[PDB]
Amino acid sequence: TTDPCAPVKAFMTLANMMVGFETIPMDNQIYTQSRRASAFSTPHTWPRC
Amino acid sequence: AYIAVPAVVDSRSSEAIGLLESFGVDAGADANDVSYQDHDYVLDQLQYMLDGYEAGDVIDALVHKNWLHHSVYCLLPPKSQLLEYWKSNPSAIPDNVDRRLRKRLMLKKDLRKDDEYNQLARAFKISDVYAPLISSTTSPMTMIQNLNQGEIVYTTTDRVIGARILLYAPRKYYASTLSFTMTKCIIPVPHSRFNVGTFPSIA
Amino acid sequence: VLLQRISPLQIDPTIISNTMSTVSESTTQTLSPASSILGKLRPSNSDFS
Amino acid sequence: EVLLLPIDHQPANVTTPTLDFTNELTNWRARVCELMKNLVDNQRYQPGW
Amino acid sequence: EVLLLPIDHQPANVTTPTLDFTNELTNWRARVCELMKNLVDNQRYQPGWTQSLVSSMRGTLDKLKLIKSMTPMYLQQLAPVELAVIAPMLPFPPFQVP
Amino acid sequence: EVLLLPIDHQPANVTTPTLDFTNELTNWRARVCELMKNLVDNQRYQPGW
Amino acid sequence: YVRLDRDRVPTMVGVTRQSRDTITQPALSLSTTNTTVGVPLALDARAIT
Amino acid sequence: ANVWGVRLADSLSSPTIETRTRQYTLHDLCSDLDANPGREPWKPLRNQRTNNIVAVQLFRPLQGLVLDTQLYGFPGAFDDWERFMREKLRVLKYEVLRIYPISNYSNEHVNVFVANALVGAFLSNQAFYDLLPLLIINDTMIGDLLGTGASLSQFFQSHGD
């Protein structure tokens, strides 16, 4: 796909499936580790980890 | 001036009989000063409401009703039946409806397998078009408040109280009970100085 | 009413409708912002009291 | 001999450009539209889309 | 003006909640599940079971531990607020001991 | 006279193609498969199967 | 196309057809007299894989 | 004198002079995060019969560990724990230095509450990126923490003033 935020959506897909099994630090309390991977659509939402 | 008496009052029967004279009121000579409300339909609506809810909250809600202000309920068919009724006679669609839905509804073609109309159909909600909706879960107090403020109160259920209910669509689409006593035909009064009713109010 | 009958201004809601002229994807379920604002504005109504 | 108004007034001239930000009312519309861009620019305030 | 609660209350900081496991009730569930795992894996108990049954039980315990329930977070972030807004209009005012 | 692409391009040097695994997308498929094997062989996950 | 360089990710594309109050040079009014252009299209990952 | 069976000496004594206090700066925070062998934010405690390290005392920072031990998931032995803490603190030091260069904020004052909360959140793998803009004191520690209103809320709650 030509969506520039594709690599992040690939990463967050596995992070969503592994909540409670493996934990990583997010940025804020809005875009947490259980937020749907479809929401990560803009460059500003790319996590630091 | 609204006066409440502990008896059932009707427009014609309570006028024919001396209800005020029965209670002991002195004669008023010309009767143009007084006018009687009709609350028998309100009473059977009260029984119907009591069938579903508790007595106390329904009574408390009905206390706050202003009998000097007119308003009516507009009963709508279910969502699907409303869609077919709009598909027929397409002049009925209001302006608030989505442009894509309106154009697709004018398709005048079998829309079962278009799937764009279908995804729009799952997307559609009646509350989007009509703001005041009882939705069969609304509290009686909220019913009475929405009836007090405004003239037309839209509803999707028949278990309401306070005013006459008018159909929005032909009877074919409605599959509910044939409560013709409160439900009128699909197609379509000043107060005197003194108005006599049954239920007291504190509005 | 007196002001309306003497002012050269004329209110034509079709200006809003013509300029929008946009559309969203068929699969896109979120209603295009264009169709959303048009529903709120209601250009067909002609009362301006 | 005076009549107060809640907005500013200027001498009549029909050859005024439409996009004249000197006009107070036109300037107000532009400022509001610019703010709404900053609100939806980074999708910070719109999760669940 | 004070209500007591038998569980810890932590006010929520967002209006759009998502799933969260940082709760005392979730910790309680995890500890119970791991205790049962230890009991099953004890060497004085395992030899009396078939290998397939042991594997199935361990998988079941893992699934129960990792189930996605919102009730423990609701009980920590929202139920006290509802109780507080309901209390002042009760016919029988609350009567509590520590 | 320039056309951009989102993937690497390498001109072919033969007119009779044959199966080849030296590609970006072939490496991508292999890496994903090996990742899932590591998850299955993990000490925290294997005993449950 | 950028790979993972977030700093170079495009965020908008705009076209202009007018000028503002008194500016005559296009380079001095392009930034604030443009209309954003773009639309997303959805695909099915089930079919592509 | 005697009290309930606790004997007391017949003389009195007390300290006389207090030490002046010094503020906490970015250089101090960075030196603390760089746990050099000479100075650490921790000190070991030993058993008095086997002379074995069994516990450790935590100075500042590392005073914000409020969650369960399992969440942190520390190594058991003292040497392994020391190493683990050193590698984990290095990354946090670089993360804070990314936002605050030493050439500009060399002698600024840092908020102790925010420092402790940041270290605790990072060690417990929680959302800590929001605490960074509050690291440097603006007017007052308590005022800055009171004015935030909406934070993680497992570290700070505001009850008015």
Overall resolution, Å? 3.0
Q: Which residues of E touch A30 (CB under 8 A)?
A: 14, 16
The residue of A22, A26, A30, A34 whose CB has the most chain H CBs within 10 angstroms, and thus the best one to mutate to test that interface, is A26
Q: Do D20 and G21 touch (CB under 8 A)?
A: yes
Q: What angle do CA A34, A35, A38 make, to 5 degrees?
A: 135
- Residue of H152, A32, H160 lying closest to E11 (CA atoms): H152
Report DSSP state, residue B196.
E
**Alpha carbon of D12: minimum distance to chain G alpha carbons (Å):** 18
Report DSSP state, residue B25.
P
Token pair in block for residue A12:
């967050």
Q: How does strand B152-155 pair with strand B72-75? A: parallel
Q: What is the DSSP code string of chain D? A: -----SS------TT--SS-TTSHHHHHHHHHHHHHHHHHSS-SS-TT-
- What phi and psi values does residue B2 have, to the nearest 5 degrees? -100, 130
Q: Is H3 helix (H, G, I), strand (E, B) or coil?
A: strand
d(CA D10, CA F15): 78
Token pair in block for residue H153:
């809320």
Q: What angle do CA A8, A11, A15 make, to 5 degrees?
A: 130
What stretch of H or E contains H143? helix H141-147
Q: Does H154 touch chain A (CB under 8 A)?
A: no
Cβ neighbours of F46 (radius 10 Å)? 11
Burial of G2-11, coded b for 16+ CB within 10 Å and e otherwise, reads eeeeeeeeee
Q: Does A30 touch chain E (CB under 8 A)?
A: yes
Q: Do G9 and A4 touch (CB under 8 A)?
A: yes
Q: Is the peptide bond before A4 cis (omega within 30 degrees of 0)?
A: no
Neighbours of chain B (3+ CB pairs under 8 A): C
What stretch of H or E contains A10? helix A6-17
Is residue B132 within 8 Å of B154, Cβ to Cβ? Answer: yes
Token pair in block for residue B126:
């009646």
Q: Do H153 and E27 touch (CB under 8 A)?
A: no
Q: Do A25 and H130 touch (CB under 8 A)?
A: no
Burial of H117-151, coded b for 16+ CB within 10 Å and e otherwise, reads bbbbbbbbbbbbbbbeebbbbeeebeebbeeeeeb
Cβ neighbours of A3 (radius 10 Å)? 12
- What phi and psi values does residue B33 have, to the nearest 5 degrees? -75, -35
- Residue of B68, B73, B19, B67 lying closest to B199 (CA atoms): B67
Expt. technique: cryo-EM
d(CA H146, CA H86): 33
Q: Is G8 helix (H, G, I), strand (E, B) or coil?
A: helix
How many whole angstroms from its chain centre is CA H131? 15
Q: Is B169 helix (H, G, I), strand (E, B) or coil?
A: coil
Q: Does B118 touch chain C (CB under 8 A)?
A: no
Q: Do C35 and B95 touch (CB under 8 A)?
A: no
| Half-sphere exposure for C32 (CA within 13 Å, toward CB) | 19
d(CA B117, CA B20): 61
Which residue in this structure is represented by tokens 């969503």? A16
AA identity, residue B109: K
Is residue H123 within 8 Å of H72, Cβ to Cβ? Answer: yes
Q: Which residues of H touch A48 (CB under 8 A)?
A: 129
Q: What is the DSSP code string of E30-43? A: HHHHHHHHHHHH-T
